[PDB]
Write a protein that binds this ligand. Sequence first.
Ligand code: NA
Lengths: 54, 57
Amino acid sequence: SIDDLDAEALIRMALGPRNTMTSSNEQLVDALRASLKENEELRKESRRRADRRQ
Amino acid sequence: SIDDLDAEALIRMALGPRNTMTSSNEQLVDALRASLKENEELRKESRRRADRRQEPM
Ligand code: NA
């Protein structure tokens, strides 16, 4: 019964798994990109403080 | 021809896009998780280094 399906399943029905897997991967890439930028910033902050501390 | 294809294309030829996209997804989840955990560890390290009492010299 379609009433029992969640949004993810409805979307896949309408757009197909190639589309939904592609969007999932794009979003994962956006998330990982953001996380690695935060990693870069944390490392920069750490280096500045090591320098401050001598 | 097959001789001109790079590795990624050979794997897709043999396994198809559902398999290769699924593998990419799984690697991306793994990478995301590792990146977020690493960030947490760096934040912990900065708290520890803020206490300069244990500072090597
Ligand atoms: Na310390």
